[PDB]
Amino acid sequence: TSPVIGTPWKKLNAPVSEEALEGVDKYWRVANYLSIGQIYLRSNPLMKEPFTREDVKHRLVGHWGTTPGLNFLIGHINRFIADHGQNTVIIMGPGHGGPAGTSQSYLDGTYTETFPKITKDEAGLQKFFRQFSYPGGIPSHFAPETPGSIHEGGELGYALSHAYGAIMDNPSLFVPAIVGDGEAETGPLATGWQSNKLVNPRTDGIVLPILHLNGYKIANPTILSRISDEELHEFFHGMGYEPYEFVAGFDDEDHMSIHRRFAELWETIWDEICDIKATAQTDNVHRPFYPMLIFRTPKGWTCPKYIDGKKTEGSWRSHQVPLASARDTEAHFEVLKNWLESYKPEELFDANGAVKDDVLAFMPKGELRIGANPNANGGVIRNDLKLPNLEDYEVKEVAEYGHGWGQLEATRTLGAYTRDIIKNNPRDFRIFGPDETASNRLQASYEVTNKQWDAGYISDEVDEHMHVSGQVVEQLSEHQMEGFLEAYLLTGRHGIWSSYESFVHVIDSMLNQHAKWLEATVREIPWRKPIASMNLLVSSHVWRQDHNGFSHQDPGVTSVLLNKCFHNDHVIGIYFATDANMLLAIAEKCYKSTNKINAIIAGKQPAATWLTLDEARAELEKGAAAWDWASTAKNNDEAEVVLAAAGDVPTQEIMAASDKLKELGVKFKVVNVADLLSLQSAKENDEALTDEEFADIFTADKPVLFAYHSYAHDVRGLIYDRPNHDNFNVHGYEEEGSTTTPYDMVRVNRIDRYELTAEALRMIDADKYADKIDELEKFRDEAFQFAVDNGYDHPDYTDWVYSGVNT
């Protein structure tokens, strides 16, 4: 549960002191100096003579354009924090402005506190400049390596979804969220503005959007800087914001005036925020118009206005570096020298190379500092969830009537379970879902909380299970749902979201970035404590999108997640819920886990339950398992074939194939896979099955029929170095399907029980069985023709029950 830090939502009531503003100007000037330094200088940080091109980096890596803008804002936010004692986390949309984030951390004292090698003296200042975007050094973005960051801003557009996740169930948290005007052109950013109808000003914190309207992205102007100011204002008002606009640096107005104007404006907005928060103590059912700030300043603010006759300040040319080289010529190095001198470092640094005390006297102390605030390292806040007994959700009926029982909808059991997680962990757990929580069958959670909704109510006949405050949130944007949950985890809370499988792909790129964040964190950032896993229920999956058709039939998220399964990072979970009981086992493991993206593939369709809780726990701990009770073979030598399934439906088709093989008197072994990564080469993954364990399950010499939920390519590439790999005959989804019957879905993809049975015969003795094979292919066409003619499936397919079930 988020901590109450500082003295939240306090008005100042006095003007901002001239003293504190002189601080901010110094912060600004020194942060700009540190920022140019990190880009340009390998040595001689303070320009002690002789200062020459030998001091300048060979390759210029880093972004200036965004950075002076960031430095001004952060300077002013640091003043704000100190004077008000406000719990504040910043979201740096333009994450390519990493020099501003490292500067902030250097100057607030979290950098030295975290990297003691980087000292508050000339020598520390020198390693500090060299390390930036430099071999064996630090990233060029506001990376997880930087104290203060929960958002890299590498991949643009998640600034607002991250900002609004952070404040959820975080009533003391202020989040000034800085958004690139280029970033604002992305789809994820454009929908993120609407988050203000999904948060409550009493129970959640406050996000102040700051649009960094610097006029440009890389090689273009931005749309929002070149529409009318009037359009820009209606735009933000229409999305439920009170827009304030600040314009500085397009004229000769001196720095002190700029700082005085800004500080008055900032305090006027803050006053408005303190009134929103004070009102919300009495009235949290009326949605307020939340302030947002349009920060219009020239890109590259304070760089040379022109370089080699090209406009540089207030241009896209300042995007990366305004001065392409400071080595090629003396005239160029001279521009660097002048530029660095214009911040007057002689005033900012004492002879020992430390920043003077009067630069940083206005700065916050302790856990209020941007870099030290525990919300920016949410691991330190994160508690274990109080979990209910998994026993109470177990489908007991498998133990009663045998493996293969029933027509249960597995995701309902995950719903009962998550419901009680929310009940027992209020303010600490959230379900997100893109208008799919009921569709994926997770609505049992509506018994103990509601869908959070802070737009209009109209009627009890339609507005069911909705309140201004609640642990479930739903918007039709996978981006928003991935986004909110990511930031809710980064600030030390927990959750699950669900998606139709096909549409997980919408946020493939966001899985990549959070995976990279997690990969970087577990390799080389041990100060950044572990966060709860991004748990993702993948359901309404390909084999039962027979009702929605081809658009909804893509299980390929499996393939994407496999490209983040390296270096024994163990940040990817890929689980196949065989049934309700396997789903509970996976669920508990995932909800206990940390530093992972967990993807749980589970059906919502009525389906058999195969395992007891115990059998599922067992299969899950190793990842795969022989099903002895299902196997006509007694050991691997007797076995003529290995029937292996991954996914609840493949399991179903394999078990049914197994009953037809059973009647022809074939000896076969049945294998279930629940953990895809258990099959990964034991060379690449220390948690996979050993080649010995693998060979014991898949036999080493017998052919294996593998029925796989997703695309067969996934397995053929996982097991390339595995014992017996060349005897694996892998069936998976094959881009066949439409709106049809469950049976046609498996049939047309050659993973139906009939084809599986036939395939198993072909692989034992083709000629010996030529006629039972030919009988099976004929029936395959007859059952299809039965569906075409009757509009439901042949009763052979429909009415089948595993032989192992008794009345």
How many residues make contact with a copy of itself (CB under 8 A)?
Answer: 138
- φ/ψ of 108, rounded to 5, equals -90, -10
Nearest Cα to Cα of residue 298 among 214, 212, 180, 181: 214
Q: Which of 49, 231, 251, 252 binds a copy of itself (CB under 8 A)?
A: 231
Q: Which is nearer to Ca ion, 224 or 511 (CB)?
A: 224
Q: Say how far apart CA 692 and CA 723 lie, in whole Å.
A: 8
40 among the known binding-site residues?
no
Give least dist CB 291 to a copy of itself, A: 16
Does 549 bind ligand TPP (CB under 6 A)? Our answer is no
Binding mask 484-503 for a copy of itself (x = CB under 8 A): ------------------xx
Does 218 bind ligand TPP (CB under 6 A)? Our answer is yes
145 among the known binding-site residues?
no
Q: Which is nearer to ligand TPP, 262 or 349 (CB)?
A: 262
**If phi over 0 gives left and psi between -120 and 50 gives alpha, with beta otherwise, what is residue 44?**
left
> Which of 152-160, 194-202, 256-264, 787-795 is the region at the interface with ligand TPP (rule: CB under 6 A)?
152-160
Contact 316, 218 (CB under 8 A): yes
Quote the DSSP letter at residue 543.
G
Pairing of strands 597-601, 624-626: unpaired
Q: Which of residues 334-393 bind a copy of itself (CB under 8 A)?
A: none
Q: Which of residues 274-333 bind ligand TPP (CB under 6 A)?
A: 299, 319
Q: Which of residues 180-209 bind ligand TPP (CB under 6 A)?
A: 180-183, 186
How many residues make contact with Ca ion (CB under 5 A)?
Answer: 4
Q: Which of 25, 113, 121, 155 binds ligand TPP (CB under 6 A)?
A: 155
Does 506 bind ligand TPP (CB under 6 A)? Our answer is yes
Give the helix/strand (H/E) hosting 265. Answer: helix 255-279
Binding mask 54-73 for ligand TPP (x = CB under 6 A): ---------x-xx-------
182 among the known binding-site residues?
yes
397 binds, among a copy of itself, ligand TPP, Ca ion, none (CB under 5 to 8 A by kind): none
Q: Which of residues 217-276 bind Ca ion (CB under 5 A)?
A: none
Q: Which is nearer to ligand TPP, 23 or 434 (CB)?
A: 434
Contact 245, 291 (CB under 8 A): no
Pairing of strands 405-409, 606-609: antiparallel
**DSSP symbols for 432-459:** E-SS-TTTTT-GGGGGT--EE--S----
Q: Say how far apart CA 101 and CA 310 lie, in whole Å.
A: 28
Q: Which of residues 195-224 bind a copy of itself (CB under 8 A)?
A: 197, 215-223
93 among the known binding-site residues?
no
Residue 243 bridge partners (DSSP): 292
192 binds, among a copy of itself, ligand TPP, Ca ion, none (CB under 5 to 8 A by kind): a copy of itself
Strand segments, DSSP code E, in 491-533 are 494-500
Contact 603, 745 (CB under 8 A): no
**DSSP symbols for 28-70:** HHHHHHHHHHHHHBSS-TT-PSS--GGGB-SS--S--TTHHHH
Nearest Cα to Cα of residue 156 among 66, 89, 28: 66
Enter the tokens of residue 121. Answer: 């003296």
Q: Which of 26, 79, 96, 332 binds ligand TPP (CB under 6 A)?
A: 96
Does 139 bind a copy of itself (CB under 8 A)? Our answer is yes
638 among the known binding-site residues?
no
Q: Strand 451-452's sheet: what is its strand order?
A: 466-467, 451-452, 472-473, 429-432, 494-500, 534-539, 597-601, 572-576
65 binds, among Ca ion, ligand TPP, a copy of itself, none (CB under 5 to 8 A by kind): ligand TPP
Contact 269, 293 (CB under 8 A): yes
> Which of 213-221, 269-277, 727-735, 769-777 is the region at the interface with ligand TPP (rule: CB under 6 A)?
213-221
Q: Which of residues 687-706 bind Ca ion (CB under 5 A)?
A: none
Pairing of strands 310-311, 466-467: unpaired
718 binds, among Ca ion, a copy of itself, ligand TPP, none (CB under 5 to 8 A by kind): a copy of itself
Does 138 bind a copy of itself (CB under 8 A)? Our answer is yes
Q: Say how far apart CA 241 and CA 708 lie, in whole Å.
A: 49
Rounded CA Rg of the chain: 30
Pairing of strands 534-539, 572-576: unpaired
726 binds, among Ca ion, ligand TPP, a copy of itself, none (CB under 5 to 8 A by kind): a copy of itself
Instruction: Determine the residue with CB nearest ligand TPP.
Output: 180
Q: Is 306 helix (H, G, I), strand (E, B) or coil?
A: strand
Q: Which is nearer to ligand TPP, 184 or 783 (CB)?
A: 184
Q: Which is nearer to ligand TPP, 76 or 731 (CB)?
A: 76
Give least dist CB 162 to ligand TPP, A: 14
Q: Which of residues 607-646 bind ligand TPP (CB under 6 A)?
A: none
Q: Say how far apart CA 539 and CA 709 lie, in whole Å.
A: 12
595 among the known binding-site residues?
no
722 among the known binding-site residues?
no
Does 483 bind ligand TPP (CB under 6 A)? Our answer is no
Q: Which of 251, 462, 635, 663 binds a copy of itself (CB under 8 A)?
A: 462
Listed in sequence order, the residues at least 6 apart from 766 whose beta carbon sits closer than 8 Å to its beta carbon are 773
Cβ burial, residue 260 (10 Å; 0-12/13-18/19+): middle
319 among the known binding-site residues?
yes
Does 775 bind ligand TPP (CB under 6 A)? Our answer is no
Q: Is 532 helix (H, G, I), strand (E, B) or coil?
A: strand
Give least dist CB 474 to ligand TPP, A: 9
Q: Which is nearer to a copy of itself, 103 or 740 (CB)?
A: 740
Give least dist CB 648 to ligand TPP, A: 21
Q: Which is nearer to Ca ion, 159 or 323 (CB)?
A: 159
Q: What is the sign of the dihedral through the CA atoms of 112, 116, 118 and 121?
A: positive
Q: Strand 624-626's sheet: what is its strand order?
A: 624-626, 668-673, 641-646, 704-708, 728-731
Residue 625 bridge partners (DSSP): 672
Does 795 bind a copy of itself (CB under 8 A)? Our answer is no
Binding mask 529-568 for a copy of itself (x = CB under 8 A): ------------------xxxxxxxx-x--xx-xxx-xx-
Does 99 bind ligand TPP (CB under 6 A)? Our answer is no
Give least dist CB 518 to ligand TPP, A: 19
Q: Which of 12, 61, 416, 700 binds a copy of itself (CB under 8 A)?
A: 61
181 among the known binding-site residues?
yes
Q: Which of residues 144-203 bind Ca ion (CB under 5 A)?
A: 180-182
Nearest Cα to Cα of residue 550 among 787, 714, 756, 733: 733
Q: Which is nearer to a copy of itself, 67 or 133 (CB)?
A: 133
**Range 32-35, long-range pairs (CB < 8 A, 24+ positions):** 32/67, 32/68, 32/71, 32/302, 32/343, 33/340, 33/343, 33/345, 33/348, 34/99, 34/102, 34/103, 34/106, 34/107, 34/128, 35/64, 35/67, 35/68, 35/71, 35/99, 35/100, 35/103
CA distances from 243 to 240, 276, 478 (A): 9, 15, 27
Contact 763, 796 (CB under 8 A): no
Q: Which of 68, 99, 144, 157 binds ligand TPP (CB under 6 A)?
A: 157
Does 251 bind a copy of itself (CB under 8 A)? Our answer is no
Provide the annotated binding site: 63, 66, 96, 154, 156, 181-183, 214, 216, 299, 319-320, 439, 441, 500, 503, 547-548, 604
Provide the annotated binding site for (S)-malate: 63, 319-320, 500, 548, 604
Residues that bind ligand TPP (CB under 6 A): 63, 65-66, 94, 96, 154-157, 180-183, 186, 212, 214, 216-218, 222, 299, 319, 434-435, 476, 500, 503, 506
Provide the annotated binding site for Ca(2+): 181, 214, 216
